[PDB]
Structure 1
């Protein structure tokens, strides 16, 4: 079963979405910090396992698009 962001092996729901480990800590770091990234292409870069380092801008976008949010643990509660 697979990461919905990069299609590497999924390691569980994280921030509300079946993702792999690397995408989980990736999202968390982008959300807590600055995410002023530039796409060098057309904002549709291919994020898979070898290429996911290439474009943070598009990786973050695919994170948001897949529905990740930080408060999804204390917010998949109330």
Structure 2
């Protein structure tokens, strides 16, 4: 099969560095679209949801927060090292 190198904010099979963190494709555009305005979402739980290839589309509030945490930031490759 494939081995594995899991994305820093779900756990899917990562694609490359995205806006600064090893994330998959989805985390890639999810974060971009979230950041580019209006990320007002409410959590249905107590601000700590679990994540993964499925549960990830359950709560954008938490996913966006997990992006932020991983380090994902808009002008990543501008500075890299």
**Corresponding residue pairs, total:** 75
Between structures 1 and 2, the one with greater helix share: 2
Identify unmatched segments of 5+ residues in structure 1: none
Identify unmatched segments of 5+ residues in structure 2: 1-6
Alignment correspondent of 1:8: 12
Out of 17, 29, 32, which is 2:33 matched to? 29
User: So what's the TM-score if we normalise by structure 2?
Assistant: 0.88
How big is each residue's C-alpha offset from its partner over 1:2-28, in whole Å with a ceiling of 9 and x where there is no partner?
x01000010000000000000000000
Instruction: Tell me how far apart the structure 1 counterparts of residues 10 and 37 of structure 2 sit (CA, whole Å).
Output: 21
User: So what's the TM-score if we normalise by structure 1?
Assistant: 0.91
How big is each residue's C-alpha offset from its partner over 1:9-63, in whole Å with a ceiling of 9 and x where there is no partner?
1000000000000000000000002100100001110121101111000000000
Instruction: Tell me how far apart the structure 1 counterparts of residues 37 and 26 of structure 2 sit (CA, whole Å).
Output: 16
